[PDB]
Design a protein around this ligand. Structure first.
Ligand SMILES: [Cl-]
Ligand SMILES: [Cl-]
Ligand SMILES: [Cl-]
Ligand SMILES: [Cl-]
Ligand SMILES: [Cl-]
Ligand SMILES: [Cl-]
Lengths: 556, 556
């Protein structure tokens, strides 16, 4: 296959079985051959394990460097120059103003801090876009859409290579620390799959074949979601639901091992009940979640579809610099948009132990705008953590509203409340209303805290979010960005006449369909079997051909 | 399709989609039609839920009645005639000897108790076999093999009906209380699937089609395993791994809801760390588990294959009576085989707070013999709980051996121990060495207690058990009993020439395969697409045919 060509799944199976026959022919001869056979099976298993280990280590390293640089934005701890703001306190911390001006508070100190924050955001974003564009342009974007296309038989050559992995890790640290409204969670699905591909080359079962490396990539997507959220079961379900549609009963256990290994290695790397009357707020958040998703999926796509039909497409670096400058300028004054979005999530998910509503509302509006304008620019811009932050801010605003309403009106028969729970519900609602996921997401949240008492709220909000978000288009953000890039991804009354062109190497087993066959049956054949091209005959006459491209063109 | 014919999966899909088209044609017209569409989707969901509820209620009711009758074997509590031995103590309890003879201990009292125990075992077993043979012969056996064949497109008409369900429930209570070395766990997979089928008839989406009820049966098998072990995730995995091989991403969430609902309703119905040096014992149990399975699968099958080639086949009732008489005669004297096997498991899994080894060894030998001779006779004989009891007795024997060895030799550098953990490990090893399951089983055990500290022992023992049991034949007990009954179950170098016969209703879309096609490709096409018969052409000539029967004969 040449680049950007979908794979003939049947031939992948045939060559796999031919290698099985070759190996098994000599397997029984000598003890070394049985050792080699066990070695091949355990080689599949070490591919899963190495993917898990590397994904965990890279997720941990990205987390550490992202935190350090995000805090470097606004100060430096003179004691040790390798601790962040919340690490050398564990006077010691001196922001840039007193480092230069010498004083703590005052108009001059504030202006100096503001300028330094803007400059550091600009410099980090500029480095991110520079490195990605110059060294590995395949490192931009969340990277899950093309992974779903790759697992669906597509070839993008350098999309999961060494250079894409290196530049995505570096520029994902830099883009997280630049303050852009993006994440390092989906990008970690892409980085986990980059590890999966890079390790598949080690062993001959997967380096030679394309079906087997698609299995390994399923496992790697599971591991990536695990490290992204720290939810091994959640990562397995995320691979199951969104990133793949081929699970031959094995690339579930292998996904689970990858996810568990990655979560454990991530952990190593570190140098109150709700009342029934709250479901109405919880469901409310769900609806908001849905709307968000819907809005986003339209708006963002429009923007991306506009970036390909105007000057922007030729100006990536200027775009990233401008977005980073606007983000930094409008983010600093507000003490909630200044914080790392992950730090804002940790702050908004926790319980306390009018200004808050105003500042949270401003944070919400700013994040909603800047994620629409951010997701897509040429930096490793994930989409889990800013969707969670938008949802969490909305949830906490609703929780504070409930607190005030109950306190001022507790005489109501309804009440006769932990805002952290509202933040969790809103985050799950807004994360499932975009990506259009139902259960994997709820499971990720359940393992994100472990409490079983929040399954009803989370399930209710996530389901409502998906139901409301589907009313504006069934396809999610990661599939609506395939239908935009026009990849040949076959989504999982007409005949074969309507979709047939024309209007030692001889493949001796071409699967044929009669012209009178329903089209839906041919689509089903391609989906279940993954055929690349099927002849269409009339009474056994070499009459026409159908290819995935033809089916897709009919779909479009 | 007539009885005992496998289904053409493609036509099932086609009729399903035709019903979708018909419904959607009128769906948008009036609000009632949209309500009907939502009603159809939620009808699939209420089928899952009703299956879960009925399975939970029947599992609870079977548990209650089985316990009461098992204790009725050996006494009666005069205060209330609806409590068991361990329920009216919660002088009150008078065994048959003091009820009739009037005295408690003495040769006469013991003989009277022994005779009463034997007589009650005989009467319960005789009722079990009588009812099954006279009213519903489809109620015998574990019932999972034919369920795996049914989910694989087979028709057995009355195998999942009202009469099979009623008689399996009644005779499963009676066969559990008769002391036969059998269970009510696998039988509960069959009873859950009987509920699934009986409820599929309620709604028109599933009553009309065969693919859709196969999905419902997947969900029902999940619910049945849930009630059997009280492990909803374990039940979902058991359906995933053993009872089905079609999971279109939906009959996972539906399986999970069925399993959760059934476990919860079952709950409603109720009127120490291990040291590293123990893995060597744990793995040892695993090996034993494996061997057991292997032995059993051969031995039992031989017996079953002998029951079909001798007088036995014409004498079911005499066989059940004789087996029950021998079981009762040899079980009473020993205080461990006298107890309900579930009670023996609850006792062998718990910690204390030379006679024991001898009596546990006698229990083990007796159970190993009587389950080989029992599984198969015409009573609802499950195979989970006696395999677990054999494994638990072996595990506890090993745990006691470890206790004695360490106590008498603690000076050994190895030690410088909870037998309940050994019982758990042995039960899991012996249950996975028979059924050849790896992860579903470990997950069931993990949820059977909830402790995470026992995942390494259980995983090690179960994996070793499967590896050792596969060395004597890959097929498990529930598939080796399909290859005995010869059902057309397509298990998930030659051409189509080698396996082709001869050596408004016109189906207009027959899927041809060229004579030069590899056989493996045709088998794969049948498996992934579930075709019933495929033409085979030479240069588009109506040359020969292949049917599932032909492929199966080829393997046979
Ligand atoms: Cl992307
Ligand atoms: Cl993210
Ligand atoms: Cl993402
Ligand atoms: Cl059976
Ligand atoms: Cl059982
Ligand atoms: Cl069973």
């Amino acid at each position: 296959y040449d680049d950007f060509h979908t794979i003939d799944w049947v031939r992948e199976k045939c060559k796999d079985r031919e290698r099985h026959r070759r190996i098994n022919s000599k397997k029984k001869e000598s003890a070394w051959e049985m050792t080699k056979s066990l070695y091949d099976a355990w080689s599949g298993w070490l591919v899963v394990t190495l993917t898990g280990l590397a994904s965990g280590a890279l997720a941990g390293l990205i987390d550490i460097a992202a935190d350090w640089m995000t805090d470097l934005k606004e100060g430096i701890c003179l004691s040790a120059l390798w601790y962040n703001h919340e690490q050398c306190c564990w006077p010691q911390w001196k922001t840039w103003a007193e480092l230069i001006i010498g004083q703590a508070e005052g108009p001059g100190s504030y202006i100096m801090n503001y300028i330094m924050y803007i400059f550091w955001a600009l410099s980090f974003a500029f480095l991110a876009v520079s490195l990605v564009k110059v060294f590995a342009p395949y490192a931009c974007g969340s990277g899950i859409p093309e992974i779903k296309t790759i697992l669906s038989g597509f070839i993008i050559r350098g999309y999961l290579g060494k250079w894409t992995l290196m530049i995505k890790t570096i520029t994902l640290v830099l883009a997280v620390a630049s303050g852009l409204s993006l994440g390092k969670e989906g990008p970690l699905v892409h980085v986990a799959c980059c590890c999966g591909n890079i390790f598949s080359y080690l062993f001959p079962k997967y380096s030679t074949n394309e079906a087997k490396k698609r299995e390994v990539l399923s496992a790697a997507s599971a591991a990536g979601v695990s490290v992204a959220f720290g939810a091994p079961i959640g990562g397995v379900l995320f691979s199951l639901e969104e990133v793949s549609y081929y699970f031959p009963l094995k690339t579930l256990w292998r996904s689970f091992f990858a996810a568990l290994v990655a979560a454990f290695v991530l952990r190593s790397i570190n140098p109150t009940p709700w009342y029934l009357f709250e479901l109405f707020p919880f469901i409310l958040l769900g609806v908001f979640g849905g709307l968000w998703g819907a809005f986003f999926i339209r708006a963002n796509i429009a923007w991306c579809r506009r970036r390909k039909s105007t000057k922007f497409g030729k100006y990536p670096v200027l775009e990233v610099i401008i977005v980073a400058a606007i983000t930094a300028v409008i983010a600093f004054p507000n003490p909630y948009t200044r914080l790392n979005t992950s730090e804002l999530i940790k702050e908004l998910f926790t319980d306390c132990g009018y200004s808050a509503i105003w500042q949270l509302c401003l944070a919400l509006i700013f994040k909603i705008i800047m994620t629409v304008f951010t997701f897509g620019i040429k930096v490793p811009s994930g989409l889990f953590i800013p969707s969670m932050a938008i949802g969490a801010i909305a949830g906490r605003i609703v929780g504070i509203a409930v607190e005030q309403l109950a306190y001022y009106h507790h005489d109501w028969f309804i009440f006769k409340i932990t805002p952290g729970l509202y933040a969790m519900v809103g985050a799950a609602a807004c994360l499932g209303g975009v990506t259009r996921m139902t259960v994997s997401l709820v499971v990720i949240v359940f393992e994100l805290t472990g409490g079983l008492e929040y399954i009803v709220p989370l399930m209710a909000a996530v389901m409502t979010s998906k139901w409301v978000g589907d009313a504006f288009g069934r396809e999610g953000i990661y599939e609506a960005h395939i239908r935009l890039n026009g990849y040949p991804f076959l989504d999982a009354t007409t005949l074969a006449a309507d979709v047939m062109r024309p209007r030692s190497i001889l493949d001796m087993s071409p699967f044929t369909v009669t012209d009178h066959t329903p089209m839906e049956i041919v689509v089903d054949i391609f989906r279940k079997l993954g055929l690349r091209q099927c002849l269409v005959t009339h009474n056994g006459r070499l009459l026409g051909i159908i290819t995935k491209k033809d089916i897709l063109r009919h779909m479009a």
